[PDB]
Amino acid sequence: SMRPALYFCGSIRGGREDRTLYERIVSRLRRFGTVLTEHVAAAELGARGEEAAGGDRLIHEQDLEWLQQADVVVAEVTQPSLGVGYELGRAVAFNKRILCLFRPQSGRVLSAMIRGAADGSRFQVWDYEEGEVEALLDRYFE
Amino acid sequence: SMRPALYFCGSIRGGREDRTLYERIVSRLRRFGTVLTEHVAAAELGARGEEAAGGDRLIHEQDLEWLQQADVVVAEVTQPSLGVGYELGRAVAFNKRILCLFRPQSGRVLSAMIRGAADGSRFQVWDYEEGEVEALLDRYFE
Ligand SMILES: Nc1ncnc2c(CN3C[C@H](COP(=O)(O)O)[C@@H](O)C3)c[nH]c12
Ligand SMILES: Nc1ncnc2c(CN3C[C@H](COP(=O)(O)O)[C@@H](O)C3)c[nH]c12
Structure with a gap:
């Protein structure tokens, strides 16, 4: 493809x-x-x-x-x-590159099935605060 | 196995x-x-x-x-x-027999990714009211 294809998931x-x-x-x-x-x-x-x-x-x-x-x-x-x-379960079985973004200031504890799916490379889960989302995406796609 | 193995999912x-x-x-x-x-x-x-x-x-x-x-x-x-x-996404990719149970009296509309995953046989989604859960399971496993 001339451009990467991206799939965005959110509730x-x-x-x-x-x-x-x-x-x-x-x-x-x-x-x-x-x-x-x-x-x-x-x-x-x-x-x-x-x-x-x-x-x-x-x-x-x-x-x-x-x-x-x-x-x-x-x-x-x-x-x-x-x-x-x-979507994340299907994507893992398709062996997709996956980035999850979670906000700890929500006061929630993230699902162990998502946190524990991470391997720090192809399936990555990053904590972040809302103001820094652009900087993190720049880092991930650089 | 001498007994079926069952996996139960709930939040x-x-x-x-x-x-x-x-x-x-x-x-x-x-x-x-x-x-x-x-x-x-x-x-x-x-x-x-x-x-x-x-x-x-x-x-x-x-x-x-x-x-x-x-x-x-x-x-x-x-x-x-x-x-x-x-769990449901991984189970579909594993080609598992799947039964989902949803209560419309919750006032929610169920995820289109779960409702639309159904094929009425191997992936089934049933609406139900809480009092009739035993009768439905008897029907499914009979
Ligand atoms: N207009 C629409 N109506 C219903 N579903 C979708 C989708 C598919 N997925 C659902 C997922 C949230 O899942 P859920 O709805 O269970 O919170 C999102 O990442 C995208 C795109 N557009 C939609
Ligand atoms: N003690 C425990 N702590 C965290 N996870 C689990 C599980 C695994 N799944 C998670 C899913 C709900 O997912 P979620 O936690 O995101 O709502 C349930 O169907 C079972 C079993 N026991 C657990």
Whole structure:
């Protein structure tokens, strides 16, 4: 590809509390590649609306196509989410380069299944504070 | 094996709101096989305590051994959880028999990545109300 393919994960039906931060992360990711999930992140129809359209199977299948295309999977894992975890599980089995970003100031303890999936190279989990997200992404993609 | 191996998924670090229901589900699952995750579900040390022991990598690796042994993976997916989603993602890639149980009375809309993973046979997602969980499990394992 002429540009790296990037897949961004962040809670949607798990809760939209961090939606604005995800947009900030995706904006910085665009400096480093094409973000395949960019335009379906907002879920403008609402969860009930998407369910009512009967589109969840297409959401699963299309997102799994993008996940396999991805050169890097980037996940913000502060807000617990079934879909984010599922994307990470599929991505590990696809042997993907994976970066998870977690905010300790949330007061949560991150899932042991995500923290313990890390090997410090191909699956990396970084703690961070919100103000330094651009600097960390620059470091990861340099 | 002389008994089926069962792997039960339910939120822990995502939140313990449904812990009592999980115990009820696991008690009924014991009628149908060995529940490999039974005795580590309570997390008595606490999330901070387990993290402080440095045990998250062992939690990941040991649970992945049980997940591959499992004849059936049963997940209660009402409470959003990274670990539950991750277990389901790994289980799909292992081509596991999977049953997810979701309570619409939660007022949540279930993750499209879980609802849309279903194919109605090997990956099944059932809506239910809490009082009928034993009857549904009897039906699934009959
Ligand atoms: N408009 C939309 N509606 C539902 N799902 C998606 C997705 C797929 N994944 C879900 C995951 C959060 O998972 P969850 O929804 O369980 O919190 C995110 O990383 C992206 C993209 N756009 C979507
Ligand atoms: N004592 C313990 N501490 C941490 N993890 C585990 C597990 C492994 N999975 C995690 C998943 C919830 O995931 P999450 O913690 O992200 O909500 C559950 O289905 C079981 C068993 N015992 C544990």
